[model samples]
Target: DLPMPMRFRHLKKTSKEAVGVYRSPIHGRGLFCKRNIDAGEMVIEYAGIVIRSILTDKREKYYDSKGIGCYMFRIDDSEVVDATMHGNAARFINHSCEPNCYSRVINIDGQKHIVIFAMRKIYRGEELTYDYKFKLPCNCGAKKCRKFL
Candidate 1:
């Protein structure tokens, strides 16, 4: 694992703070803690451009057919954030049946930002994950895992 301070420094150079991406044992790539994070602390903000849900649906269909991971986050009945097009390292945070973090939608000057927060103390080098609740089989391999996305 990279030293915690170095990890944060690397992220800072890229204008992304607090987390780093690395190989994940769970799936593909994953976001990792760059510092010891306390419970309830803001982990990272999910960054993306806002778009209409109808257009998002069309893009989702296209990506799904190509077997790509969907990065669109729905903010309301009519709007969604398509992170696949414009996203930050936060997009690499994977899904876990037993999650260590949770996401909250915050309204900022009429725009929405999905902010992830630690549910419990997170040590440096720990991978950040959360429940995705996708409508499919889950492979997170957590103890007592629901086994379905």
Candidate 2:
């Protein structure tokens, strides 16, 4: 197992309280708002096992060979957050060209956390999404969808 962070203790207080995971028509399972979320309101915290980017690259390659999707979020040039094992519903949030939320990387005592917030007023039952900026293919189907990640 990878090393879990001590900061994760703080995350235990707020995981999936405002959002829930369910089947998403845009893709697979996705995060959805349970209540009206105002613009700038924090939706949920993206928690994961922090790992070095070099090790993350190796793991990505290993998962790729086995036809698995990687949930690694790069924090900096040398570090990444590996969410495949120790993440919350935030990991289930899919990519959208017209997203209602956005992620911000926060540093707490040298450890990094990806906190997602509402970009605009999001109604209840709306799927929460953000731009993944990935090079992989996208199937978001939004009318103005960039179509590529």
Candidate 3:
């Protein structure tokens, strides 16, 4: 079995693989894989600026006024990662009820990192998606879709 440290280091490299952004039938843009990936494989880190939970709402309001959309991921009750300004490709990933990938929080020497891993074997050209946790209508047509986030 691989250790967390090794996995953390691997994810930190931010290597670009066979992933690309294209028009998503589910929403605006989406992430698509160009090569087949194995189940449980590490895909990418949801890289962004980590901010205190208290600051999220304030920043979101700022983006709203500026006509910029907010892209954020909660690391925990006290912290969240804002991808609206400083973010990687992971920010473009959308939500799905029955997703092909899943997100995980990895700790490296006490530092928290959010990473996305394949939930099952994935084929090339398949859009990479994960459950976004809750609320707002979900257009992810998977039959098991809860119909609302």
Candidate 4:
């Protein structure tokens, strides 16, 4: 179950806006901030099991290890909860070639936390976006772009 604090009303970017849904193409099933959120503001605090195994080992063990793709956020050096794995509010956060925010794996007193950082100022109602290509590739077509990792 998602923590209470993380459960916020997700407003649509627009009535007909079609953001990618985790398990399907349907939209508006994830948590999106209704207004412009400031830097250093807590976006989401996800508490899930962190897998601790090599990349190869993790892939073999879990059927859907997509979340473990990040090199820095890999479960091998991280911790995971025993929660049933599925998409969360943060999962609806779409990919942007030029993202305004980025995430970091923070270790506080031996516990790990996922911290978000802003790269630039964001406007109100702008779709809060982050580069999901930290350990992956850029499929977002920016003019001068890299297609893949």
Tell me the whole-model lDDT of each prediction, alpha carbons only. Answer: 0.77, 0.79, 0.86, 0.46
User: Whose TM-score is higher: candidate 2's or candidate 4's?
Assistant: 2
| Residue pairs with backbone atoms closer than 3 Å in model 3 (clashes) | none
RMSD of each: 6.4, 5.8, 1.5, 8.3
Best by TM-score: 3
lDDT of 2 by residue, 1-149 (tens): 22234333444445456788999998989999887887977667777888887897689888889888778777778878888878777888899999999988876668667888789999989999998846666788888988788
lDDT of 4 by residue, 1-149 (tens): 44322422222233123222333122233333454565644455333455653443454456455444222233334444222354234545555666666766656556665544456655545565565533555554567555543
- TM-scores of the candidates are 0.78, 0.80, 0.92, 0.51
Please report, as a residue range, the 10-residue window in candidate 4 with the lowest summed lDDT.
18-27
Query: Which ranking of candidates, highest lDDT first?
Result: 3, 2, 1, 4
Distance from true location, Cα of 5 in model 3, Å: 1.5
Evaluated at residue 118, the lDDT of candidate 2 is 86
Q: Rank the candidates by TM-score, best first.
A: 3, 2, 1, 4
The candidate, 2 or 3, that scores higher on TM-score is 3
TM-score of 1: 0.78
What is the Cα-based lDDT of residue 126 in candidate 2?
93
lDDT of 1 at 34: 84
Q: Name the best candidate (by lDDT).
A: 3
Per-residue lDDT value at 89 in model 2: 78
RMSD of 4: 8.3
